[PDB]
């Protein structure tokens, strides 16, 4: 996934 | 051999450090003994040791704050000769500013010999007073005299030492890649790391989907520590330690961005959450990328 | 299908864009036709289209500046019904703020239908005046009427589109790895990218060995564009495009840090030198790492 | 090498  | 790096240089006899008085950049500013507070930045008491190529165990010593160099006044070999801050360069041939630094007879402290005079840095009379004279003085490499013995308390890590600290951490993903940016880093006490965070304006920043989320906080904190480094210190040839990491959770279905710093003993990393100023040994993510 | 993203919505008959008057966040702020300048940020004229799950070709339209939503007043199906900015959320069930957006009969422009009323967004009388009324109006999906036809000029890229632009660049190292941080990016005109650089204070910054060298400039510029994004826009669910790259020269014996942005057509990247504000198609290094 |  993508950093949040 | 003493390694390239930043040192807090503490007398072996009394708890006085080598201090450039008032941090002044004026030529001929006295270098004196002064008391210190452990686990702080001692602003006038940090020295960058640069090894001279093709001269064994010999360095310039640049005050991190002033950017001026430890200088034996007119290179005199007379006992009681002034040791001052003076303008210079990292790889000078001026023997006033060249220092041979080797372990004393106790094998833990060092002695500091002027390359030109062959006299030693001496806390005159072992005086523990704030502002006590430091001078070039007659001596020998092997004698026990604590006036001329100095603990080089290492305040910096190499990129190799920072890489080793990351590699022995238990929260690194199998796919991890690291990207090194500089060579030699000043390690901050958490108290200072926190102060830079507090002064950044990040404590007031709100999380917002994509437009100011974890990656924005982590990059803003690295930029703030970079700005603080340049604005705070006049010396060159080092950086401030502050890492950015991207991490993924156990389940592999959420990622996060955060910062990291190093322990006091320089052996391990500690995670920093720039959204709340917390330090953690486990931030709930395994790092798959870092740059520092 | 219209893709998630940020759009400048331009009438097909006259060069008027859909404008939230004065960018006001007040409920019931008129949405009007207004002239525009290409290759600028048209501050009151950018709309974030968020697709609704389980409702085909239907979106909320959030004004990037105000953070308020295009709203058909009381959801009336009467011709001449006001279209205004109104507080809402990205995935609302309020049919006043839900819009079905599909290609017109010319296959290039779109029509915008209110999901509740089944009336269309209409630039009343095709009036090209600044402040011309936009209303919900009777119409059909297939008719040629240019009052109700709208070009959706795409101002954002996906992370997939940004990755494709990097991958087709001729200055990427064999060892390259990219690290994506967000999902959907507003692409800046160079004029705006330059203004953020000028306002950052970087133009005045001096290169210094390790303590403020290329990696500090590149990270400072990314932080400045992140700060500008959060401070400038009230909408959420997008980021501003600004990349950091590390690169290595042909000889493999020098590395450099710099930024990159995207061309107008969103197809290619352009390198940005944060030490002098220059844009380059070749910065003399091949990228081995990027984060954006 | 290392970026400068
Ligand atoms: C207490 C005192 O310690 C030693 O004397 C030091 C000085 O020592 C150094 O200089 C002397 C000559 O003055 C000599 O060359 C010696 O080898 C060298 O280490 C010096 O450190 C001064 C300034 O701080 O303080 C003392 O005078 C020792 O030689 C004395 O006998 C005496 O024990
Ligand atoms: C010039 C004019 O264009 C068309 O009329 C439009 C209006 O068109 C729409 O509303 C009418 C009913 O008023 C009808 O439902 C039509 O199918 C629909 O597209 C409307 O766009 C208004 C407001 O801008 O302007 C014109 O009145 C056309 O139907 C007329 O015959 C005439 O050619
Ligand atoms: C920058 C300045 O730092 C401190 O004053 C220094 C002083 O600092 C050392 O001595 C003090 C006690 O006088 C503490 O032990 C500190 O922990 C030491 O680092 C010396 O360096 C002298 C002589 O050069 O200069 C002073 O400015 C601090 O007390 C000040 O508030 C200020 O932060
Ligand atoms: C933020 C504000 O933006 C500009 O004024 C807007 C105006 O902008 C558009 O129209 C002007 C001409 O009036 C130009 O074509 C711009 O390129 C367009 O983007 C409109 O959005 C109106 C109505 O909402 O609001 C104004 O504030 C600019 O002229 C101002 O100096 C200022 O930068
Ligand atoms: Ca560097
Ligand atoms: Ca972001
Ligand atoms: Ca993100
Ligand atoms: Ca640096
Ligand atoms: Na003096
Ligand atoms: Na040497
Ligand atoms: Na109104
Ligand atoms: Na949908």
Residue numbers in the entry:
A (entry chain BBB), D (entry chain BBB): 1 to 4
B (entry chain AAA), C (entry chain AAA): 2 to 293
What's the publication's text?
In an effort to validate our substrate binding model, we co-crystallized the enzymatically inactive MOA variants C215A and C215A/H257A with two synthetic heptapeptides mimicking proteolytic substrates. The designed peptides have the sequence PVxRAHS (with x = P or V). To our surprise, the co-crystallized peptide probes were cleaved in both structures, despite the fact that we used catalytically inactive enzymes. The observed cleavage products correspond to the N-terminal proteolytic fragments, binding to the MOA active site in the standard backbone orientation expected for PLCP substrates. Throughout subsites S1–S4, the peptides match the proposed MOA substrate model derived from the MOA-bound Z-VAD-fmk inhibitor complex (Cordara et al., 2016). The synthetic peptides are anchored to the active site through three main contact points: the oxyanion hole, defined by Trp208 and the backbone NH group of Ala215, the ‘site B’ Ca2+ ion and a backbone–backbone interaction with Ala256. The presence of an arginine residue at the P1 position unambiguously maps the S1 subsite to the carboxylate group of L-domain Glu210, which forms a side-on bidentate salt bridge with the Arg guanidinium group. The P2 moiety binds to the S2 specificity pocket lined by residues Leu247, Ala258 and Leu182# (with ‘#’ identifying a residue provided by the other subunit). Coupled to the long time needed to grow the crystals (2–3 weeks), this could explain the presence of a cleaved peptide rather than the full substrate. The peptide fragment occupies the S1–S4 subsites of the catalytic cleft and matches the N-terminal part of the expected proteolytic product, representing a snapshot of MOA just after the acylation step, mediated by a water molecule in the absence of the Cys nucleophile. A stretch of poorly defined electron density close to subsites S1′-S3′ suggests the lingering presence of the C-terminal fragment of the cleaved substrate.
